[PDB]
């Protein structure tokens, strides 16, 4: 029967709408294989026909628009949006041509003009159900885009033009059903960067013809949903203006640095033909540039070696930048229009949708405060030589791919993809040449988020992540501090489940504090007692994993003990020297819990170390007492060795003993009382 008969058969209409919902659900969040499969059930012709049709019921109209978006555009839009908050500006001839204003002057149109920030392209593949079957990931199904954008523009223009007729039969049965779907489609197309200068000019013209020229939408009566869509549209142009500001600033920075370097060269050459004037050239470059910019006020214009023209140039640029942000020093700009529209909407009626309220007030706050947004965005800006564009783009692809897997339950394919992507990243030279850039993208935070989400059930994922994090720490001290920040979070996890075969979170925790006096001193004491508490358990109960494998049961698990002791050793001893504060704290905590020392040192009924190690050696002979890849005698002998090494490292230096410090003497006396000398001599022999 004709599908248009569903306007009078309500049960079938409801069932079909829910069927469309199920279709839209089984392909959600980047499941491209199912998206490819669905193309055999709803082909291009059906979708385009449904888009054009005017007699279709509202629910089915909305369902088909959403189905098209979900099948063909969702993944690309998400990927593009994830990278829209960063600005990597390459230094190229077209970059040098960007200016705040066209030849303080009149504002330009938002969204038009050239941009140079890096953004990776989109990838699509054509559907086909006769190709031979053969594990590379699948791309989204393809669909012509220029025709689609032309169709969307035509439909929106028709809707706006016919809105003035106040007819009694709107498409879909209401204004909301007529307007919301096309606005969603146009917003999705716009964010992806499919439109050109002429298309964006047309859109701006049909939003408000009076302001953007060299009856609109805002002047009509609309329900809440259309207003929410308009807010979503305006956010895009606000973001474009911010990006333009950042790019102009970078171009000016390059042009200024050139002249500054030339002038410093000339001045240094002259100087060779008071001695205080020579301090500039024997200081780090950051201090030099800091002092070269200290002339904002005439009172601070004494120590600047500069001339007047350069200062005038910088002052002119600063004044222009302030003018662009709306700071004074029939609306005719985006800011005034947005402010007036938001206030008028607010005072026309009492709005009920909380989402609309949040959107309006966020927009208003962005408009009133101009350069606060610039200040908050500058940290995520960077400049790059043109020779590194290819490597940067390749790195961005992998980073985005990793980011995408933050919203899906882990599976073998995801594990393989992450392993491959990390391997690819670690082989790029940019990962070494620009550590600050990597730290600005927050890759480590993403990696730890993924690691915790699966925290075993995935032993190869944790090993790779831990290795990557350790390598990241080893690059520089700033990375070391960055990872040190999350030390407490890292310690909470992996407290019973070792997954001992491969690197764990404790390993990266240890690597975050190696050979750094400042970080070691800054170490909190709450991280010390928790680790000791973890250790205390290892001295009481055997590992369930070994029991599952049939190993004989004893009342402790040496493996975890040696792991935690290794961490403590790395914490206490740095570059051939012992830090006394942590030594005292850890020895005090240990003595507070005598059970941590192991059965030999338990005291009451506890045999000496020599007897314990002899017993372990004898155990090593019997297969029955050593096993049903791991052996018990070696584990026991390693645990005791690690404990003794830790205690030895905890001892104080001899120069302190000469001063007769009470604490040092108490510590030495305690340690001496703990282990007899003859026991050590017997062990060595």
Partner 1 sequence: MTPLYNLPTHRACNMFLESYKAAWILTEDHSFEDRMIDDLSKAGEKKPDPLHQLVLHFSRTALTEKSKLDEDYLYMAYADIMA
Partner 2 sequence: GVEIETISPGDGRTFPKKGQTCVVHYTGMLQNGKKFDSSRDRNKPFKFRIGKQEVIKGFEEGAAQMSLGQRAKLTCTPDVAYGATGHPGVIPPNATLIFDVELLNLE
Partner 3 sequence: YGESLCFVQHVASGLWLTYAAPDPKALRLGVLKKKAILHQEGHMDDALFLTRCQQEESQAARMIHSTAGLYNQFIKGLDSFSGKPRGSGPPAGPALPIEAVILSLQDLIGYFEPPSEELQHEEKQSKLRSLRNRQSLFQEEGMLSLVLNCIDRLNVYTTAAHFAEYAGEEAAESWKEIVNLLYELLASLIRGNRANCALFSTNLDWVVSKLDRLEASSGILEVLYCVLIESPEVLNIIQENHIKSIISLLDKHGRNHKVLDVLCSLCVCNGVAVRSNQDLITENLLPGRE
Among residues 18 and 358, whose Cβ is nearest to partner 1?
358
Q: Scanning residues 18 to 37, which ones bind partner 3 (CB under 8 A)? A: 18-19, 21-22, 25-31, 33-34, 37
Helix (H) / strand (E) element for 574: namely strand 573-574
Instruction: Decide: is 22 part of the binding site for partner 2 (CB under 8 A).
Output: no
* Partner whose footprint covers residue 132, from partner 2, partner 1, partner 3, none (CB < 5 to 8 Å by kind): partner 2
Spatial separation of the C-alpha atoms in residues 378 and 374, rounded to whole Å: 6
- Please, what is the minimum distance in Å from the beta carbon of residue 317 to partner 1? 10
Residue 600 per-residue DSSP state: G
Helix (H) / strand (E) element for 14: namely helix 10-26
Instruction: Decide: is 130 part of the binding site for partner 2 (CB under 8 A).
Output: yes
Among residues 383 and 401, whose Cβ is nearest to partner 1?
383
* Partner whose footprint covers residue 128, from partner 1, partner 3, partner 2, none (CB < 5 to 8 Å by kind): partner 2
Helix (H) / strand (E) element for 87: namely strand 87-90
And the tokens for 380?
């995520």
Among residues 103 and 354, whose Cβ is nearest to partner 1?
354
Q: Spell out the residues 6+ positions from residue 583 whose beta carbon is closer than 8 angstroms to its own.
A: 572, 649, 650, 651, 652, 667
Among residues 292 and 671, whose Cβ is nearest to partner 1?
292
Among residues 110 and 141, whose Cβ is nearest to partner 2?
141
- Please, what is the minimum distance in Å from the beta carbon of residue 14 to partner 3? 6
Q: Spell out the residues 6+ positions from residue 83 whose beta carbon is closer than 8 angstroms to its own.
A: 119, 120, 396, 400
Among residues 31 and 421, whose Cβ is nearest to partner 3?
31
What is the three-class DSSP state of 124? strand
The alpha carbon torsion through 610, 616, 621, 627 (nearest 10 deg) reads 180
- Please, what is the minimum distance in Å from the beta carbon of residue 540 to partner 3? 7
Spatial separation of the C-alpha atoms in residues 281 and 285, rounded to whole Å: 9
Among residues 49 and 376, whose Cβ is nearest to partner 2?
49
And the tokens for 225?
């949903």
- Please, what is the minimum distance in Å from the beta carbon of residue 26 to partner 1? 31
| Residue 676 CA neighbour count, 13 Å, CB half | 10
Q: Scanning residues 484 to 543, which ones bind partner 3 (CB under 8 A)? A: 540
Among residues 73 and 89, whose Cβ is nearest to partner 2?
73
Q: Spell out the residues 6+ positions from residue 640 whose beta carbon is closer than 8 angstroms to its own.
A: 598, 600, 609, 612, 613
Helix (H) / strand (E) element for 19: namely helix 10-26
| Residue 48 CA neighbour count, 13 Å, CB half | 11
Contact assessment for residue 446 and residue 488, using Cβ atoms and an 8 Å cutoff = no
Contact assessment for residue 32 and residue 139, using Cβ atoms and an 8 Å cutoff = yes
The site string for partner 3 over 400-439 (x = CB under 8 A, - otherwise) reads: -------xxx-x-x--------------------------
And the tokens for 404?
């995408």
Residue 604 per-residue DSSP state: T
Catalog residues that contact partner 1 under the rule CB under 8 A. 91, 249-250, 253-254, 256-258, 260-262, 264-265, 268, 281-286, 288-290, 293-294, 296, 318, 322, 327, 339, 343-344, 346-351, 354, 357-358, 361-362, 365, 368-371, 374-375, 378, 381-385, 436
Q: Which stretch binds partner 2 (CB under 8 A): 36-44, 438-446, 646-654, 663-671?
A: 36-44
With CB under 8 A as the contact rule, the residue among 14, 81, 376, 549 that binds partner 3 is 14
With CB under 8 A as the contact rule, the residue among 5, 10, 15, 581 that binds partner 3 is 15
Spatial separation of the C-alpha atoms in residues 532 and 528, rounded to whole Å: 6
Question: Rounded to whole angstroms, what are the CA distances from 566 to 237, 248, 256, 559, 640?
Answer: 55, 52, 53, 11, 12
Q: Which stretch binds partner 2 (CB under 8 A): 74-82, 129-137, 212-220, 370-378?
A: 129-137
And the tokens for 332?
């005719």
- Please, what is the minimum distance in Å from the beta carbon of residue 125 to partner 1? 37
Contact assessment for residue 91 and residue 384, using Cβ atoms and an 8 Å cutoff = yes
And the tokens for 261?
């370097």
Instruction: Decide: is 351 part of the binding site for partner 3 (CB under 8 A).
Output: no
Among residues 369 and 653, whose Cβ is nearest to partner 1?
369
Instruction: Decide: is 128 part of the binding site for partner 2 (CB under 8 A).
Output: yes
Instruction: Decide: is 358 part of the binding site for partner 3 (CB under 8 A).
Output: no
Among residues 174 and 413, whose Cβ is nearest to partner 3?
413
Torsions phi, psi for 388 (to 5 deg): -100, 10
Q: Which stretch binds partner 2 (CB under 8 A): 126-134, 287-295, 308-316, 542-550?
A: 126-134
Instruction: Decide: is 133 part of the binding site for partner 2 (CB under 8 A).
Output: yes
Tell me which residues touch partner 3 (CB under 8 A). Answer: 14-15, 18-19, 21-22, 25-31, 33-34, 37, 41, 407-409, 411, 413, 540
Q: Residues in the site for partner 2, rule: CB under 8 A?
A: 33-34, 37-38, 40, 43-45, 126-133
């Amino acid at each position: 029967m004709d599908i248009l008969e569903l306007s009078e058969r309500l049960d079938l209409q409801r069932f079909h709408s829910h069927t469309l919902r199920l279709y839209r659900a089984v392909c959600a969040l980047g499941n491209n294989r199912v998206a490819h499969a669905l193309c055999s059930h709803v082909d291009q012709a059906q979708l385009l026909h449904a888009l054009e049709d005017a007699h279709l019921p509202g629910p089915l109209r909305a369902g088909y628009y959403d189905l098209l978006i979900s099948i063909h555009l969702e993944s690309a839009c998400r990927s593009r949006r994830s990278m829209l908050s960063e600005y990597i500006v390459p230094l190229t001839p077209e970059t040098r041509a960007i200016t705040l204003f066209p030849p303080a002057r009149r504002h330009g149109l938002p969204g038009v003009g050239v941009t140079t920030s890096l953004r990776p392209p989109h990838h699509f593949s054509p559907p086909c159900f006769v190709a031979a079957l053969p594990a590379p990931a699948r791309l989204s199904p393809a669909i012509p885009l220029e025709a689609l954008r032309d169709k969307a523009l035509r439909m929106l223009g028709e809707a706006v033009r016919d809105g003035g007729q106040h007819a009694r039969d709107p498409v879909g049965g209401s204004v909301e059903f007529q307007f919301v779907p096309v606005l969603k489609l146009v917003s999705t197309l716009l964010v992806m960067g499919i439109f050109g200068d002429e298309d964006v000019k047309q859109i701006l013209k049909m939003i408000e013809p009076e302001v953007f020229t060299e009856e609109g939408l805002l002047q009509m009566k609309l329900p809440e949903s259309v207003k929410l869509q308009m807010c979503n549209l305006l956010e895009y142009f606000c973001d474009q203006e911010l990006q333009h500001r950042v790019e102009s600033l970078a171009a000016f920075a390059e042009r200024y640095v050139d002249k500054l370097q030339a002038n410093q060269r000339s001045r240094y050459a002259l100087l060779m033909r008071t001695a205080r004037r020579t301090r500039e050239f024997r200081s780090p470059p950051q201090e030099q540039i800091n002092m070269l910019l200290h002339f904002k006020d005439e009172a601070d214009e004494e120590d600047c070696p500069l001339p007047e023209d350069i200062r005038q140039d910088l002052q002119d640029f600063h004044q222009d930048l302030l003018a662009h942000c709306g700071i004074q020093l029939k609306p005719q700009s985006l800011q005034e229009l947005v402010s007036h529209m938001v206030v008028r909407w607010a005072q026309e009626d009492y709005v009920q949708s909380p989402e609309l309220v949040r959107a309006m007030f966020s927009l208003l706050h962005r408009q009133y405060d101009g350069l606060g947004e610039l200040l908050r965005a500058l940290p995520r800006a960077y400049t790059i030589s043109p020779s590194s564009v290819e490597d940067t783009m390749s790195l961005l692809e992998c980073l985005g791919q990793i980011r995408s897997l933050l919203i899906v339950q882990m599976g073998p394919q995801e594990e393989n993809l992450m392993i491959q992507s990390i391997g690819n990243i670690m082989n790029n030279k940019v990962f070494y040449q620009h550590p600050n850039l990597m730290r600005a993208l927050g890759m480590h935070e993403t990696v730890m988020e993924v690691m915790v989400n699966v925290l075993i059930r995935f032993p190869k994922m944790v090993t790779s992540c831990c290795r990557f994090l350790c390598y990241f720490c080893r690059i520089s001290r700033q990375n070391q501090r960055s990872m040190f920040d999350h030390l407490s979070y890292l310690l909470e996890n992996s407290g019973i489940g070792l997954g001992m075969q491969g690197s764990t979170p404790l390993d990266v925790a240890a690597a975050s504090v190696i050979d750094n006096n400042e970080l070691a001193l800054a170490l909190q004491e709450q991280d010390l007692e928790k680790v000791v508490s973890y250790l205390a358990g290892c001295g009481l109960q055997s590992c369930p994993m070994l029991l599952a494998k049939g190993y004989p049961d004893i009342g402790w698990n040496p493996c975890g003990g040696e792991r935690y002791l290794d961490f403590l050793r790395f914490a206490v001893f740095v570059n051939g020297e012992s830090v006394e504060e942590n030594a005292n704290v850890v020895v005090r905590l240990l003595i507070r819990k005598p059970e941590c020392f192991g059965p030999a040192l338990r005291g009451e009924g506890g045999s000496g170390l020599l007897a314990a190690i002899e017993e372990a050696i004898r155990i090593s002979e019997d297969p029955a007492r050593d096993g049903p890849r791991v052996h018990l005698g070696h584990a026991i002998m390693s645990f005791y060795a690690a404990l003794i090494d830790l205690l030895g490292r905890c001892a104080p230096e001899m120069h302190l003993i000469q001063a007769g410090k009470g604490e040092a003497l108490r510590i030495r006396a305690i340690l001496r009382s703990l282990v007899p000398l003859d026991d050590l001599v017997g062990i060595i022999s």
